[PDB]
Every structure is written in C-alpha cells, then in structure tokens.
Amino acid sequence: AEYFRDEEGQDVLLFIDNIFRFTQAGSEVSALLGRIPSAVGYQPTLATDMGLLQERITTTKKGSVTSVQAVYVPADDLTDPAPATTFAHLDATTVLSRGISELGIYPAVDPLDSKSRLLDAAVVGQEHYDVASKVQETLQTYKSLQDIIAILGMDELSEQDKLTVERARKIQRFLSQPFAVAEVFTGIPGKLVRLKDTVASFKAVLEGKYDNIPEHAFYMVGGIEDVVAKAEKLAA
Amino acid sequence: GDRQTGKTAVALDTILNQKRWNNGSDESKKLYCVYVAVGQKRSTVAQLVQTLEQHDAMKYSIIVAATASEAAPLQYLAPFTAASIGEWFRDNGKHALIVYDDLSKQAVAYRQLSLLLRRPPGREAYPGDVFYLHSRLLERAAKLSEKEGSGSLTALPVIETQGGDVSAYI
Amino acid sequence: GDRQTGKTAVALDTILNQKRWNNGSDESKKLYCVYVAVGQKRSTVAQLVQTLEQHDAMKYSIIVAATASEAAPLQYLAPFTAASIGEWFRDNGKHALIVYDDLSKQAVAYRQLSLLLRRPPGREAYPGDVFYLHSRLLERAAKLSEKEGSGSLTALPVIETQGGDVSAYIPTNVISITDGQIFLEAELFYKGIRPAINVGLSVSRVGSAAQVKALKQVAGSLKLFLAQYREVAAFAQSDLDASTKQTLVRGERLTQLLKQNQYSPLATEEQVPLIYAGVNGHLDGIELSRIGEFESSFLSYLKSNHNELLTEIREKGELSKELLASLKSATESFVAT
Amino acid sequence: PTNVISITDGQIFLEAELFYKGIRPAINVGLSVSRVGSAAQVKALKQVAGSLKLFLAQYREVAAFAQFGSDLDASTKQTLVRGER
Amino acid sequence: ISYAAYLNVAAQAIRSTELQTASVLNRSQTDAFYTQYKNASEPTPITK
Amino acid sequence: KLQFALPHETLYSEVTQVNLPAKSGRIGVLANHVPTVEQLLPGVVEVMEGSNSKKFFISGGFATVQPDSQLCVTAIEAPLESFSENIKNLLAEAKKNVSSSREAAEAAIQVEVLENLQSV
Amino acid sequence: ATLKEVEMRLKSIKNIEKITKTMKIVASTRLSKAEKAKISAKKMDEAEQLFYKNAETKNKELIVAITSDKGLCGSIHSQLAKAVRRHLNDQPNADIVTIGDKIKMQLLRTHPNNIKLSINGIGKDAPTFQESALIADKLLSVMKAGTYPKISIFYNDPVSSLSFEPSEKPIFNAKTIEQSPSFGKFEIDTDANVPRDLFEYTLANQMLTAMAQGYAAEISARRNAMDNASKNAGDMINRYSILYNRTRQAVITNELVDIITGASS
C-alpha cells in the first residue's frame, strides 16, 4: 500500500479482514516466545503492534492510505481489551446491520449506529453537519416515534409528527443506492453520487420539496436528480 | 471518562481559557501548560498542534509526545521527563500545569514493560508497582511553599475508563 | 450440542441416509463415510459398529478409532490421520463425509501433550496453538476444482458443549472456522422433540446453495412460517389473538412434523411431499396426535396412488407447476381421508 | 471448603442475611444436612420434631411464592402463617 | 319478588331459534359468592 | 326520538311511533305524549321510525317519556327473532319445578314469557 | 459462581420481561371486550340519567366499592382505598360493602366494623348483568339499602386509555326519587310504586355501568403497568449484562494468573 502511496503518490484503500485473528495470531506468537500472556490472554505487545501498524496507515504529504478493517468482536465483548485497542486506532465505525438489509435498503448501514469523528461542523462543514444533524434527528425521532406510533396507531401522529414520519420514510427509501457493483446483484443500475450533490439532496428533502412524491418513488433511487426522473415515472 | 468523549477536548478548553491570563505580563498569571500525549496517534497530535497554533496557544505551551507507535519504555519515561520540565518552571516559582493524557495508557505501558521483564503480573495483570509509578508521578505536582517559590504545577491526569466502571484497579 | 444427547445419534442418522445414495452406482452418490471416534469406549464403539452392521452401512463406512484407552498421541493425530484417508477418495474425484467426533476430547489430549511437554497452555488451559491444529484440520474439507478433478471431502465436526457452553475457547475458535453450526437444545429434548435441534441456533453458511431445487421451492415458506411460530411461541401461555392463534396452529403442527424417530432417515422424494402438505396448510386440519399416523399413511397413500408423482419428484428433482398441481390434488384427497 | 465438605458428616451453614433477618445465631438449614439421620437424637425430640422438617420445607417453598405476592390460597397461607411462627 | 330480580329472571328465561351466542348465555349465568361480614366476623363465603 | 337501550346492546339509543307493553296496558307514543314513567313488562314490542317497523321481544324494563320528547326506554336484554320452542319444553320442566320450589316465581315469569312468546 | 448466580438471576429478569410483555398483550385483548361492553351499558345509563337530571334528582349510609380480587392491575386497589378512606372521614358511621378482595383487605384494616357485606367470585370475571342483579338484590335484602338514604359507589372511571381515576357517584334511592321536585314533570299517580321499582332498577343499571367502567380501567391499568415493567426489566438486563461480562473477564484473569504462577515455578 505504501509503495502505492509513497512511491506512486496515489491514494489507496487497504482492506484487512478480521483483526481478531490478527490479535489471535499475535497472542500465539507471544506464547510461543514464552512471554507472559497479558490480560485476557492477549499478547503484552498487543498495543504496540497495533500502534506501529496503524501509524503506517496515515496521510503523508505525498499520499494517503485509508484502511477498512473488520472487527470480529469476541462474543460481542467490546469490553474485551482487543476490541478496545482497535477502536482507539479506528477513527470511524460503519455498522452494517441485517435489519437494514431486511428493509431492502442496500447499503446495509444502520444509520443510528454509524459514526465518524470527522463528522463535525468544522471538519465536513457547517452545512453538511447541519443537514446531517437534522436528518439524524429526524431518523432518531422517527424510530422512537414509530415505537408507540405503530402500536397506538398512525392517527396518533399530529400533522407535524406525520410530516416527520412521512419525511423519514421518504428519507429511509432515499438512502438506498442501487450501486454499481451490485448492478447485477440487486439487478438495478448503479448510482455513484458525488459529495456536493449528496448535501444538496438532503437539503431539499429537509425543506420537504419532495413531500409530494411518495416514499416508494425513492425506493432504490439515488440522489435528487435521479428522483426527479422517478417522480415523473411515479406519475406516469 | 470514556474514550473519545472529546477526551482531549476538556483539557484543550482549559489551555484556551488560560490564554488571556497567560498572555498577561504577571508572572503569577503565567501558567506554562504541558500536554503529555501518551498512547495517542501522531496524526491526532498533529491536528491538535494545528488547532493549538490556530488559537496561538502553542507559544505558552509545550507538547511532550509519546505516540502509540513509540515504544513502551519511552512511554514509561514520558511522564517522568515531562514533569522535570514542569519542575523547572516550578523552580522558577512560576505557575505551570501538566495534563497527562492518557495516564491509563501509561499504566498499560508499564504493564507491558513489567510483563516483558517477566516480573509477576499484579491485579488485572497490572504490576503491583503500578501504584508506585502513579504516586511518584502525581505527588511531584504541587504549588511549593511561598519561601521556595509559588511555582505551581497543576496536574490533570486523564484516565480512560473502559466500561465507565470506575471500580477498576487503575 | 449437548453432551451425549445422542450427539452420536444425530450424526449416525446421516450415515444411514448415505446408504440410499451409496446403493446407486454413481460415485458422486457414493460418499464413503468416516466416523472418527476420539476417546470413545470400545464398548460404545462396539455398539456403534454393531448398529452399523445392522444397517449394513459397513461397506462404505470406515471407523477410525482412537478409543478412550488409546493414548493422547494417537488421539492428537486421530483427526489428521483420518483426513489423509479422505484425501485418497477425494483425489480419486469421489466424495466422502468425515465426521470428527468429538474435537472436545481431541483438545484435552493436546492439552495433555502440551502440558507434559511443558509448553505454556493457552486460554481456558487448552494449548495456545490448539487453534492452529483446528484450523489446519478443518480447512482440509474442500470441494475441489473441476480442473483438478471434481472431488470432495465433506466434514461435520462435533463439539460437545460443556453444559451448553458455546462461549468456551474451543467452541469459539471452531465456530469461526466452520461453515454452519447445528445447535442441539435440552429443552427440546425434554419436550420430546427428537431431533432436539434448535434450528434458530442452527445456521448454515452454505445453506440453500446446496439442496434440492424442488425442496427449496417448497421450503421457503417453511422458514418464514417457523420464524413466526418462534416469535409467537411465547404468546402460547390465555386469551389470544386470532392471528397469533392461526400461527400457533400451523406452527405447532410443523413442530410435531419435524420430529423423526432417531435412527430412521427419510427419502427426499417423500420429504418433499410432507413439507408440501404443510405449505398447502392442509395439515392445519390434522390433529397433533394424528400428525404421526397421518404422515406414514400419507406416504403410503402417495406410494400406492401417486407413485408416479414420487418417481417424478425424484427424477425431475424439480417441481413444475403441473407437478405441484397434481401433488396438491393428492394431498387434498389424502387429507379428505 | 470443598475438601472439608467431603470429609464431614454434616454441614451447618449459617446465613449472614438471616443473621440480619434476626436469627442470631443464624442458620441456613437448606444448606445444612446431616445424612447420619436421627441417630444421636433424643427419642422424645425425634417424635415431636417429625414434621417440623416438613413444615419448614413447605415454608421455604411457600415463602418464595409469597414474595411474588400472587393471590395465595388458604392452604399456602396456613403454611405461611405456621412457618412464620 | 324484587323488580330487578324479576327482570333478571326474565332475561335469563328469555335466552332459552333456540341456539344462542355464548356471551349471551354467560351473561345470563355467572357464579359468585357473598361473604357477609357480621362485624371482622363474617358468615362464610357462599354462593350468591 | 327514542332511545331504546339494552345492557349488552343498544337499539335506538326520529322514531315516530312506538308501541310498548306496559303496566298501563299498551301504550303508543307519537310525538309529544304525556311525560310518563311506567315500568315495561316482558313484551312484544313494535317500534316504528317513520312507517318502517321493527319488532322486538324485550325482557321488560322501564319506559320514560322525558319532558323534552326524547323517549327513553331502558330495558334488560332479551330481539324478537332471536328469542323466537325450546322454552316451551323447558317450561314443562319448570312447571314441575314450581311444585318443589323463588323458583315458583321464576317459572311463573317463564310461563308469562311463554304466553307472550306464543303471542308471536 | 458469581458468574452463574448473575446468569440465573439474569434469566429470571429475562423471564420477567417476557411475562410482562405477554401480560400486556393479553390485557389488550381483554380490554377490547371491556370497551365494547362499556359503550352499550353507558348508553342505557345515559337514558336514565336524562330522567334523573330532568327529575332534578335532589339527592347510616352505604359505601360500595368495586375492585377485583386479583392485584397487579394498576394502583387501582390502593388509590381507591385512599379515596374510600377520605370519604370514610366524610361519613365515619357508614357501612362499607366491598366488591373485590383487594379493596376489602385495605378497608378491613381501617375499620372492620364498617365492613358489613363483602362479595367474592366477581373479580376474575368480566362485568355481567346477572351478577349486578344478584348483588343489587342482596344489597336490598341484606343491607336494607333503601333505609340508608345515601348510597355512594366507588369504581374507576377510565379517564384515558393510558389512565384511570378512581371515581365515585351517588346511587339515587327511592327517597331521592320521592323528593326530586321535577319528578312531577313526569306523569305517575300511584298506579305503580315507581319509586320502589325504579330505585331497584337504577341500583343495578348504575352498578353494572360502574363495574364496566371499572373493569375497563382495571384491565387498561394492568396493560399499562405490565408495559412499564418490561422497560424496567430491560434496564436490569443491561445492568446484569455488564456485570456478567466483567465478571467473566475477571474469572478468566484470575485463573490465568494461577496457572502462570504455577508455570513460572
């Protein structure tokens, strides 16, 4: 990766699979070396090995290596030291869920469990942040609202509340990208939507300009431009 | 508190507030603040440094760095060395402050060292002299008797508690 | 799964079904089974052997035996040695099934070796490189490339849960390596559900990729129905909603249906009909006690009346709408009687 | 404790919570057994205390149920009242 | 005989088409007891 | 208007003529009628809203012309068609029952009801 | 040990969550029937109330109360108990007839003299006219209800589908009917003993309605309570989960240390 970054000056993206099995491998080598297995078995050199590895993953003045790593939590014990040490090195976490995939939303991202530390009013812009925050608040309120709204009845929603429910369900559908690799796999042409147009799309939805286009005309539909077409097809 | 709850930010705000006081001409209003970055990513520190230099707070402050990459004995020696600089200020009779961020990662460093010296593990595998390290470090931070100078060295050691269950040895 | 709850019994059922395919000439249908008895009493294995002889399964069976008396070095090498035998069949392009039973006793033997060799023991006092042993063993099971000749060596490792513990070091490692799990459950055993498999905690990472197309067609519904039955299971204990109650009727009948008298496997060409009936919900109209009698009777009714259908299901291996139509008619007719 | 338990002919567990509950000396007779039966027990006391065990055992079950505070039948409340005294 | 006893009895008799909804039949026949309390003191709970 | 209300049901709780069987014989109400209170006996009832008429068998109740012309019948559940043979068989048993046993009164109400049923 | 004792207790909490969920659902099922009934009953009552209003009703004494034998259906039992006690300050010498074991027990403590009649075999069943009629009949015979020219009944008005307020109303005696002035703006002479019939009749009609209102409030309260319980159980699950996880790690660490210490020698 570094040959690409340093010696070909090009941005890279390096996937790693399970870092649990990275840890397990390291733990074994420690034990083989006869060194005292540190707490919860893990090697005493657990921290340092990650430290070297994930500081060779950085933005140099000539390139930047991005790395996507997979964290196989040990029985979902985030409490365990090996995940904790990993999370310290990690900057963002993308938390795919199967519930989301079951809502037919591809990407499978669980939006209330995906967080980055580069999400800020400064780092990604105030506008971007505000748009994100509103959408997040919308989703956050929507989920919580759906808990007793579903049970009690959808009529229990106020005009404002169902404005939010409508917007939320429209957003929820709007999230799904029929993306290019899975053009075949879902069967629906891909959508690669540029960053500027992503912000723009959510601003408009926040202003509820497409709160006249039903929620299922955004299902498996890309950005704002795309749902102009789909709006037309919905009518036609 | 818990990891990256803006863990860094709390300390940063103190340093920032003590810009007006520190940019005073009164030597009794001079804090000389040291940020010891232990077990922290060199990138993150560089962003922090840039933040500090944006608020031009760097000119009254020192950064000592012992990043995650940097080896465990260096990490072990990082708080002790930093405190010496603080004592020079202290022994100017001038007020100082030192933030040991994260002293919890220093504990892990001393743990590593102890284990690698094949010295017996203590509770939670942190050696029994983990206490000794911390007590020696912390009690070297003081505002000396007025005769010996009014040089403070205020300590804010930043502990990253996993689980937030503070009934934990470290 | 749960300790000696006929863990070996669950395994043995498969071996018996391999007789049916074995009888057939095709060597893709000749899976040459290997049961690898690790740390097992000679009497217990004698009973196994005797049972195997009774079902004439010995004529493709191999019993690799490292008995309880047989020492820990033999036990350590016992799955590895067995695997090598498997390579010969596989290399010949044939297929075979190796059942490693149980790696839990293999682990202990390795523990005995390591501790005695004074090597530092890993987590839960089981050697540190026990993972390395298991990973080597369990990755030898492979469906080979067509290029390097299509062969296979199916494997089914058996792990004995120490009081149902699945968080234990030896289970956790193995769970990661394996492509599926089957998780036996004590409540189910007690509730007379034999097999006592808890299908919620059973998973397959190969799943539907292999299985008869016919059986796939008539069992998508089954997954969904059972899913509801599980959720609405706890609603079984008063004054209950009609919707839930309908689920309970369909679901309970299904639960009885998946009971099978152990050491008796069923022919797929008749498995497809039984599930089909359930899919057509005609079993909703059959009393729980009478499910069992119904089942055998339905099979006999199909055997006399619609053995054209049975042969069609078998040979086509797929179900045409016309075949499902005729099958439904047969089910209706039987259900009426 | 494990080693001793095997060696001995009885265990006489005292429960701390029951100390606080007001049995001082405390007891915890669910974890107290003497499997050498009524041997070396005075004959009179053997006769009288014959169903003392049954009452207490029933009391133990009943008391647990009573804590859940479900609508109790009179038979359970006979036990409960008897047990308490 | 009490007026409300009279109507009750009439309703009960009238649910004797001959075949009627279960809820009607149940609403015309439910078991109960009356525990009179003489004081504390109390005549025994007995079928109302 | 009329409000005809049962405990378990409700009927008319506009109704231009109502014909009721009462302790005052039989009463017919159209528009304003005197603001009477009469206990209704077990009855064969006709209720007409307009000319359209629906006929009810009622286990008795109470009748009250409210002084605002809101007729209010409150009565205990019996419909005519729902009641309307088994009771006649039952009555034979109940008559026997009068010999042995309040039950005498019960069977007495039942015969009154049977006669009234026979009327339909 | 710790780990297992945590785990069994956590299993208890899990079972509790499940049960409190289940109970809430079954309560909802029952609630539907309760509400359905309550409309029909209330309609009948309203027609009588039209009489009492227009009549200008012009209202030892009785206190009647309604709760169920069973508990765990809101604070129905004890909020009503407190409010009975308040109205037992309002009439110390009143004879309390308690319909329901839970209200029976609490009041029985405050005055056992005042407990005169009590009724069992009602609480587990939905309100029914047959019951109401019999209770009324016994009230007249046993308590000589008409002698006490004030009657008051307590029940739970189901204020909102999420609420219940214990409520009371006064049953209108034959004395009440008698001294109602605009009674005379309803025609009767002396042909029937309309006070003595209507009194009996409204004793039951009012009582049935009160029971229906009460039952609906009770079952709704039971649903509400059992819902809030499920939430509380979840929190306890989470708390024991953290304890379980930490406890598991600590045991592992302690065991490892012992082995290591042995190995070191």
Cis, bond preceding C120 (omega within 30 deg of 0)? no
For tokens 């009549």, the residue is G55
Domains and CATH numbers, chain F: 1-84 (2.60.15.10), 87-119 (no CATH)
Shortest distance, CA G29 to any CA of chain C (angstroms): 7
In this structure, are C231 and C200 located in the same domain?
A: no
Same domain, yes or no: G149 and G217:
yes
Q: Are residues G47 and G14 in the same domain?
A: no
Task: Please indicate, yes or no, whether residues G21 and G119 belong to a single structural domain of this protein.
Answer: no
Residue C145 tokens read as: 């490339």
Q: How many CB atoms lie within 10 A of CB B145?
A: 8
CB contact under 8 A, C237 and G30: no
**Domain of C61: which CATH number?**
3.40.50.300
Are A84 and B121 in contact (CB < 8 Å)?
no
The residue segments making up the domain with residue G234 are: 1-25+226-265
CATH of the domain at E8: 1.10.1620.20
Query: Are C232 and C247 within 8 A, CB to CB?
Result: yes
Residues G93 and G38 in one domain: yes
Give the integer Cα–Cα distance in Å for A133 and B33.
35
| Rounded CA separation B87/F23 (Å) | 110
Q: Are residues G81 and G4 in the same domain?
A: no
Tokens 């420690």 found at: A30
Give the pair of three-digit tokens for residue A91: 């900057």
Residues of A with CB under 8 A from a CB of G: 36-37, 39-41, 77, 79-80
Is there a cis peptide before residue A91, judged by omega within 30 degrees of 0? no
Q: Please state whether the peptide bond connecting residue F67 to the residue before it is cis, i.e. omega within 30 degrees of 0.
A: no
Mutation target vs F (from G43, G46, G48; most F CBs, 10 A cutoff): G43
Size of interface B-G (CB pairs under 8 A): 11
Residues G205/G45, Cβ–Cβ less than 8 Å: yes
Chain CA centroid to CA G224, Å: 13
Check whether residue C77 and residue C138 sit in a common domain: yes
Q: How far is A44 from chain B (nearest CA, A)?
A: 5
Nearest 5°: phi and psi at C123?
-55, 135
Q: Which two tokens stand for residue E48?
A: 């109302």
Residue A120 identity (one-letter amino acid): D
Residue C4 annotated in ligand binding: yes
The identity of residue C133, as a single letter, is L
Under DSSP, is residue D25 helix (H, G, I), strand (E, B) or coil?
coil
Shortest Cα distance from G186 to chain F (angstroms)? 4
Do chains E and G have 3 or more beta-carbon pairs under 8 angstroms? yes
G56 touches chain F (CB under 8 A): no
What would the two tokens of residue C320 be?
């045409």
Q: Which residues of C are catalytic, by number?
A: 205
User: Nearest C-alpha of chain G: how many angstroms from F7?
Assistant: 5
Q: Identify all chain D residues contacting G69, using CB atoms and an 8 Å cutoff.
A: 71
Alpha-carbon torsion, ordered C155, C158, C159, C163, to 10 deg: 150
Cα gap F81→F10, rounded to integer Å: 16
State which residues form the domain around E43.
1-48
**Residues of D taking part in catalysis:** 35
What Å distances lie between residue G71 and B75, D68, D74, G18, G190, CA to CA?
A: 63, 12, 17, 19, 48
Give G101's contacts in chain D (Cβ within 8 Å).
Answer: 71
Which chains have 3 or more CB–CB distances shorter than 8 Å to chain F?
A: E, G
**CATH number for G64:** 3.40.1380.10
Q: Which residues are paired to C155 by β-bridges?
A: C98
Identify the domain containing residue C43 by its residue range. 1-211
> Same structural domain for residues G89 and G199?
yes
Taking a C-beta distance cutoff of 8 angstroms, is the pair A102, A75 a contact? Answer: no
Give the nearest chain D residue to G68 (CA atoms): D71
- What is the count of structural domains for chain C? 2
**Binary contact (C239, G26; C-beta < 8 A):** yes
Q: Which chains touch A (3 or more CB pairs under 8 A)?
A: B, C, G
Identity of the residue in G41, G47, G129 whose CB atom sits nearest the CB atom of F72:
G47
**Residue corresponding to tokens 């980055």:** A116
Q: Are residues C193 and C225 in the same domain?
A: no
Q: Cα(G224)–Cα(A190) distance, rounded to whole angstroms?
A: 48
Q: Which residue from F6, F8, F72 is facing G50, i.e. has the nearest CB?
A: F72
Q: Do G263 and C120 touch (CB under 8 A)?
A: yes
Round to whole Å and give the CA distance between C261 and C12.
12
What's the structural domain count of chain G?
Answer: 2
Q: How far apart are CA B56 and CA B54, in angstroms?
A: 5
Contact F39, G51 (CB under 8 A): no
A172 touches A205 (CB < 8 A): no
- State whether G151 and G250 are in the same domain: no
Distance CA C329, CA G4 (A): 55
Residue G123 DSSP one-character state: T
Chain G partners within 8 Å of C238 (Cβ): 22, 26, 29
Are C155 and C224 part of one and the same domain? no
Q: Is A219:A176 a contact under the CB 8 Å cutoff?
A: yes
Alpha-carbon distances, residue G75 vs C9, G29, G207 (angstroms): 55, 21, 21
CA distance G253 to chain B (A): 7
Interface of B with G in 119-138 (CB under 8 A): 120-121, 124-125
C6 appears as a binding residue in the annotation: yes
User: Do both G20 and G150 map to the same domain?
Assistant: no
Gaps in chain C following residue numbers (C to N > 2.5 A): 237
Residue whose C-alpha is closest to residue B102's, from B29, B162, B57:
B162
